[PDB]
Amino acid sequence: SIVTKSIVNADAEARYLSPGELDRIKAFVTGGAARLRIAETLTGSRETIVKQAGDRLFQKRPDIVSPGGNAYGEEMTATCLRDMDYYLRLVTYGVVSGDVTPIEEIGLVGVREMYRSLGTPIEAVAQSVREMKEVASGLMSSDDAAEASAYFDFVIGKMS
Amino acid sequence: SIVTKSIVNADAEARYLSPGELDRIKAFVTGGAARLRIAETLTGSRETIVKQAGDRLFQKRPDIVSPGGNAYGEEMTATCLRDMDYYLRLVTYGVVSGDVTPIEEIGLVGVREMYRSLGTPIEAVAQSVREMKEVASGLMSSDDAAEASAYFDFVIGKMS
Amino acid sequence: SIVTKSIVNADAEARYLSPGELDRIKAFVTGGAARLRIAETLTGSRETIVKQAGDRLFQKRPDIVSPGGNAYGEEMTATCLRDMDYYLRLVTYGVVSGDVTPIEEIGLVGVREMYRSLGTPIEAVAQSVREMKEVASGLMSSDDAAEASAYFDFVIGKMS
Amino acid sequence: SIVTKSIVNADAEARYLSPGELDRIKAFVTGGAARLRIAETLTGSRETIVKQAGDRLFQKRPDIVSPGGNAYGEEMTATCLRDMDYYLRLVTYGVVSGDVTPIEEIGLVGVREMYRSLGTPIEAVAQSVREMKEVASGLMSSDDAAEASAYFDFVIGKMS
Amino acid sequence: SIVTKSIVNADAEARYLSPGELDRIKAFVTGGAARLRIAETLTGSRETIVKQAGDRLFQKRPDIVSPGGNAYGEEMTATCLRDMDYYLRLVTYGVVSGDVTPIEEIGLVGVREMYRSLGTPIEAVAQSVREMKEVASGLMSSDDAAEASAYFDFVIGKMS
Amino acid sequence: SIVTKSIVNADAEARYLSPGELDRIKAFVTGGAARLRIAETLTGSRETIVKQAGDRLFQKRPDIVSPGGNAYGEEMTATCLRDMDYYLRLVTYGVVSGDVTPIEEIGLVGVREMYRSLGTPIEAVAQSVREMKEVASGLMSSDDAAEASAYFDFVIGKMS
Amino acid sequence: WQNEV
Amino acid sequence: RQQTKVFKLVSTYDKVAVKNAIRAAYRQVFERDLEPYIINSEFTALESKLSNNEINVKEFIEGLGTSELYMKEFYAPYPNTKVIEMGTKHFLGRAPLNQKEIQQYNQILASQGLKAFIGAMVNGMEYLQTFGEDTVPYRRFPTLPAANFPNTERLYNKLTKQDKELVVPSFTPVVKVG
Amino acid sequence: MRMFRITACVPSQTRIRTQRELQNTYFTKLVPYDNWFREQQRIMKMGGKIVKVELATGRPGTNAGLA
Amino acid sequence: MQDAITAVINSADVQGKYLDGAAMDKLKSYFASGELRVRAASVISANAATIVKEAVAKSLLYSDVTRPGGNMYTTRRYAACIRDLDYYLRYATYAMLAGDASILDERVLNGLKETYNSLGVPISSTVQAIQAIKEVTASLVGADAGKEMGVYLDYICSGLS
Amino acid sequence: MQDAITAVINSADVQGKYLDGAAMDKLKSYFASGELRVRAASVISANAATIVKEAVAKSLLYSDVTRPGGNMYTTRRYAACIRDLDYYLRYATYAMLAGDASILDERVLNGLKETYNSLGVPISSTVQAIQAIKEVTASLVGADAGKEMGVYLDYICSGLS
Amino acid sequence: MQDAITAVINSADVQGKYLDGAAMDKLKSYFASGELRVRAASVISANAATIVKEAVAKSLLYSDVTRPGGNMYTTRRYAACIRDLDYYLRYATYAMLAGDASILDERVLNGLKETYNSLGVPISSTVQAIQAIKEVTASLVGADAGKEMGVYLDYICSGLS
């Protein structure tokens, strides 16, 4: 959150928050209502988002679910949808917090090494996040669509 | 200026001035009419607020105007009024700019050392700035008073 | 003490005392008799020295007791005189010890924070210790006066 | 010179010279006549004292001039005589300075590397400077024996 | 040993041993029979190797045993033989291990402090180890002479 | 080269090359003949290796050559074959040098950022490097192929 | 002229 | 480890940034704001030199280390081992690496004093590879070598003057030579 | 204390740092005499080029009085 | 650093006088241009990497600079150019949004020319890349914002020149 | 750094000889002057803040330099100027105590002229401030002590000029 | 730095073609010379301190440099000169191992000539000291390795000249 970053910077400089930090917190608190609305919209359609995202990803990348792929079995496809649910939850966390801090701190530091250990294609996961972004933009208002697509694009770029 | 502070923060993080600061700059540039109106309100009646603030400081701190004190002489008090005029002008510059960077870059960096070489009771200067803030708040219209008081009590906080 | 000061400076380079430090310790141990004689001459006239110094200061700088001043209250005049006595004790400690280390360790370091927290002017109390030095030099032998005025001068200039 | 050392310490502390330093240079300047007398006596009787101390060093350590030692060969013993001359001149320089800085930086700092390159038995040079100490004490007054022996002890300890 | 050196070098870069390190260890372990035989040869002639090594050293630098030298009598010459057997054992340790680090761990770290606190001319110790190398190479095969001469030469270099 | 690595390692410790390091350069200069033979084998069939690896990768990754892909078009395929030739040349340089430093310095540092800017899938080029690895192994002896496999897999792992 | 052995 | 700020003096034109970096360097080196520990700021010359960009932030850090205040605070009241711990914590950002590092730094502190220790620990290759020539040193969270992380955590998890015990007196050798 | 001023350009050979780097890439700094050997050894070992060096403070050949 | 607001404030402060009608007009003009500046900065930050992509593609790629023997050869040098163009685009955006070309002087042009000379970076090719970036940004962010970016890019290349 | 004693020691060290009669009388002269030099240094340290205070009062205050537009306007550079004057007084006292100007050219004048020229600090105003320092110190300590104080202060003036 | 293999690789890479016959001939030459280089390196690692000692003795000791007033006077400057020659010998050995002069250029000659000029070190004297190094190392390693070690020492002297 912007509050945490501002307090960390102030503690590093060992000073009380400046007026710029304070009115930044003011604007953040004011926009918290719309951010909560977007978070609720994404949370209420979690299963739908993950389902169409997985379907579109498998249509675009059938090799991963094919025999011999990383996500062949029904358990493997369920595990893809599980990772999808994790990343959608992290996106909702970031939307609530107004920044990409929770997303990076939870599921973006060392993700490349993790999927390399599991043999998971990073590009396929990025395409999955892109499909989620498309679905959420489709079922959500344009301004809110851009606001959530900011975090979605951050996650996608972090993957790539 | 708020734009300069935002650019400094982005350069510190090596960013492109993310939308969380772009919207703040947008709001500042759109609402600058009120800030500039406060600028005329402070500038036009600067002599007034300067005089009543100096008065109130002298009732609250008459020792400084006493022959033992620093302000005695009928010209040392003139120099106190001159310093208060400079601080009011700096507050106007900060209000028009949108941040406190001109405040600190003009008259807050090393102000303690500046007043230590003159024997000035710096806390009395903070009290004078407080009196100026009170007079200005009583002279302007509510929310404008709070907007100016942010920069004012920033000045007091750095001064004490 | 010159002993502890020389030991600390020696251990900073991690080697035995240099010939200069040993010679200075020679002179200090030899002149400890005269230093302690100045110790009695300062310790026996504490009430008169503080009385005359504070009284004459109160007419150098009437602002200390002027209306709204730092020490308008008779209680505050006595408090300033108690600070007088503390500083005189510390200077006597330094004179007897032969080094300015006791002054620094007891009542000099952080004094600026002291007197900004309490708001007392540093310059006025520096003039206080100057009047202390003047009265003490008046009330003792010439060489004793110079030796004690060395530490008086150190405390005055170094805190001021 | 102790004046340079005191100035260096004060500059390191970013403070004017303390009363201890002022007394140190005062005692040094008032007692400069004795140091000059020691310097003149050492310069006048340098040739005999160096030869006698070299003879006593030979008597302690005949192997240095045995057929295969560093001093063997009249060239290689005249070079010992010249080295003892250099160290005696360095001690004379230090006596008129009040500190050991010229001794440290002309013949002490990096002496071990030079004598390792040349193969000289540095402990033999320590015995030689010791013998210089006894010779100087014999030729020179009792009270000045302490002052000269302090510098000789410093050179022996550092160069041992 | 060489295995320890390779492990440390790999640990420095935080990686597995490279194929160069692996096949170097391969060649070393395959050829270790010759190294162990050469260590046996050096061990067997230990008494004689020390005997004519010391004899040639004293004939080359009699000052260490002459009047003024470190090892005057048969007692201190026996101490020299003791240290001489120490460094012969160190060279044998290096030959069996195949790498000089154990020598550094045993008789090369702080050796200058040892032979300065004892007054022993370290150059004479280097000459004694050189007499090691000469006589030992005299009493062994030329290729084996070079194999042992590597460690004798390293000890000589650490001497000077 | 191993010579450069050993020299830098010795210099960082401020010493000379240890005996074991010297044997390592001995072994490297002995094996330089086999290294140059492997270099000849790689260089002689560079065009055939590049062509076969490119065809194999195109069959395995048709998206890059498919319409809308990075390598789509005759010119793009020619450029990718040029990149393949570049990496084969780097592998030959690494083989002749005996280490991976030239490969890393010329075409392994910043490759991720470079190909991200060019819009080239890094994993596809890593697969192409793998294919060149098998093609080179097929055209080359078992020991030579094993030696070159180290550099090939280093390039693959660093880029992948 | 000697050394303490 | 993530909720911190790294002070890089990118440009000396911004005087406010220079002052902030100087204060942060004071806090890191001395562990505290040096208002109640000094009569007056003795590092004014170093501040002016850094503000004119005639020296780098590494030079400022070294000057802070080679100061009478540091030897008054973290060298005078502690033995050499505690001085090694505190110095490696303040400048390098982590506890001593091993017994080799402790032996070396003890050698400098026994042969040339605290100034040589500070100069060697500041001009070392690790310092430049970690903080460069413009970054004020910051607390580190190293993973290797062994026991470096626990020692650093114990060093940094206790406030200034919390206790006089030695967190890392010396690493007990598994194998004793000779 | 016989100070040097050195103008040196230290490039980056391993990492592509994404933030501004002229503050430590090409810099004119002040280094003491005692530290200068170690500083120059470090700079050379880091691949940088010593563009210029001079004795800004101090007098060459001063046998005594080098503090 | 100084922007239009900071420039006006400094101009008023050097005379030690409060803001007047001329300063007010300057402030209103900057506020009016602020909408264009903010939207241009946002659009540039959205796809700055793409801007660098077609900037380098049409100016340096498949040329002597990228081929062996040029200063863009090897992946490290290519990444150095990518990061340098990112620097130039980001700082041009900073200058445009601030409205004053003071960030470039004290953060980009400060020691850049001589640094390239010491490192051997060809100045002319860098200027050509800057011109390509100018054209790409002008085509991407419109005419008025395109010209506003172009003036600062020209300032950067002239300082390099 | 070197004092008169160390200067004589170095001069004799260049020829590697014992101190002759010329150095003999030089050391006598320095030791004779030290009696006055110590008192002058003590008295200067007594009011080093003061002398800077009234010197700035009579030399720079209420002038165009301290007014807006002047190079002392704004509190930061005012504090910088006061700190510079404190440096000048302290290092001139150091030179007087040491009796030799090596400390002056070695610590206070290291690039000071170039720094002042680049920063735009008015050299004439600085010289006038130093002259005020010299006059105040000479009045405070005395004619002779003020004389050797002022020779070093004029050394700072010449180095800055 | 670079060695023979790295030098050949860079020379081939700058025009971006594979190692042809000439490059592999040079590689064969260096591989053949590696045995001699390793042996000479072992000898010099044996007797570096000696070679420095008799080199300075036949070039510097009992001369105008070591005497008072000379740059090598005083134990401090003597130790500095000894360390300088030690580092020169070590780096010449390093270049001999590598077979390339790059290490001397980028690790021994950048910032050293003007460092001596700033310190006033006698370049003509250090040249003769390095030549003494050349002769002493030739007397030990032999003529075959002595000529190449002299080549590297001459490179050091010419860069210092």
Ligand SMILES: *[C@@H](C)[C@H]1/C(=C/c2[nH]c(/C=C3N=C(/C=C4\NC(=O)C(CC)=C4C)C(C)=C\3CCC(=O)O)c(CCC(=O)O)c2C)NC(=O)[C@@H]1C
């Ligand atoms: C084909 C299967 C893969 C692929 C290749 C590809 N590369 C480019 C363009 C370039 N490649 C390079 C790379 C290098 N140049 C060097 O000097 C070195 C260091 C030794 C390397 C690695 C460069 C510089 C370019 C840019 C063009 C130029 O030659 O200057 C392309 C075309 C890119 C374009 O848009 O023109 C292609 C297709 N791309 C894939 O997707 C495959 C995985």
Ligand SMILES: *[C@H](C)[C@H]1/C(=C/c2[nH]c(/C=C3N=C(/C=C4\NC(=O)C(CC)=C4C)C(C)=C\3CCC(=O)O)c(CCC(=O)O)c2C)NC(=O)[C@@H]1C
């Ligand atoms: C007199 C020369 C000046 C002055 C004095 C003054 N002091 C106080 C209050 C305090 N002064 C101190 C200072 C010290 N206590 C110590 O123990 C030491 C030495 C070891 C020092 C330097 C403290 C601690 C206090 C507060 C606590 C206490 O009084 O015990 C006051 C009162 C301030 C108030 O408004 O409360 C005054 C007036 N005032 C002047 O104007 C003189 C320059």
Ligand SMILES: *[C@H](C)[C@H]1/C(=C/c2[nH]c(/C=C3N=C(/C=C4\NC(=O)C(CC)=C4C)C(C)=C\3CCC(=O)O)c(CCC(=O)O)c2C)NC(=O)[C@@H]1C
């Ligand atoms: C690329 C199209 C052209 C080119 C560029 C090039 N630059 C470097 C190296 C550096 N470039 C800079 C410049 C900056 N750093 C900054 O922080 C900023 C200001 C914010 C600028 C302008 C620096 C400092 C370096 C060196 C340090 C580093 O690499 O981080 C290189 C690499 C040089 C090398 O090999 O060392 C290159 C290739 N070269 C061309 O030929 C193109 C015309």
Ligand SMILES: *[C@H](C)[C@H]1/C(=C/c2[nH]c(/C=C3N=C(/C=C4\NC(=O)C(CC)=C4C)C(C)=C\3CCC(=O)O)c(CCC(=O)O)c2C)NC(=O)[C@@H]1C
């Ligand atoms: C007044 C209520 C308090 C007070 C102040 C006081 N100040 C001076 C003199 C000067 N102070 C400054 C400096 C500044 N004034 C500003 O507004 C700012 C802008 C950032 C600064 C830095 C200056 C320039 C002067 C005069 C010098 C000049 O050239 O103009 C005095 C007079 C001091 C004297 O003895 O002359 C006074 C009295 N003192 C108090 O006691 C009040 C609490």
Ligand SMILES: *[C@H](C)[C@H]1/C(=C/c2[nH]c(/C=C3N=C(/C=C4\NC(=O)C(CC)=C4C)C(C)=C\3CCC(=O)O)c(CCC(=O)O)c2C)NC(=O)[C@@H]1C
């Ligand atoms: C005062 C008499 C004049 C004056 C002063 C002034 N100086 C600066 C800035 C600097 N001054 C110095 C000088 C030194 N720093 C040191 O450490 C020492 C040696 C111990 C000296 C002599 C330096 C280095 C600077 C630059 C860094 C800094 O600002 O601290 C300023 C500020 C300039 C600016 O624009 O920032 C000023 C005002 N100005 C006058 O008008 C007087 C004549």
Ligand SMILES: *[C@H](C)[C@H]1/C(=C/c2[nH]c(/C=C3N=C(/C=C4\NC(=O)C(CC)=C4C)C(C)=C\3CCC(=O)O)c(CCC(=O)O)c2C)NC(=O)[C@@H]1C
């Ligand atoms: C004599 C009892 C011991 C001894 C002496 C010895 N010295 C040399 C040669 C030199 N001595 C010096 C010393 C100094 N030069 C300086 O500038 C200073 C301070 C002023 C000192 C101490 C130097 C530099 C030399 C080199 C020759 C030259 O000066 O040109 C020798 C000759 C050794 C040789 O191999 O020629 C000797 C014998 N040797 C002992 O064993 C005694 C313990």
Ligand SMILES: *[C@H](C)[C@H]1/C(=C/c2[nH]c(/C=C3N=C(/C=C4\NC(=O)C(CC)=C4C)C(C)=C\3CCC(=O)O)c(CCC(=O)O)c2C)NC(=O)[C@@H]1C
């Ligand atoms: C000896 C053959 C000559 C000589 C030597 C001498 N050197 C210095 C001082 C320094 N020498 C260096 C050398 C280097 N720095 C490097 O990075 C490299 C690469 C290995 C080298 C060779 C340095 C950095 C210094 C200054 C720092 C320091 O000395 O620690 C001196 C001292 C000069 C003085 O004290 O003023 C001397 C005497 N002098 C001669 O006359 C010989 C020709």
Ligand SMILES: CC1=C(/C=C/C(C)=C/C=C/C(C)=C/C=C/C=C(C)/C=C/C=C(C)/C=C/C2=C(C)C(=O)CCC2(C)C)C(C)(C)CCC1=O
């Ligand atoms: C102690 C000590 C040492 C010094 C040691 C010393 C003093 C060493 C010196 C030893 C000496 C003096 C050796 C003499 C060697 C002479 C030879 C080989 C000449 C032979 C001539 C011949 C065969 C000619 C024959 C002839 C021929 C063929 C003719 O044609 C006809 C006639 C003729 C006769 C000419 C060291 C320096 C080692 C270390 C330090 C130290 O203190």
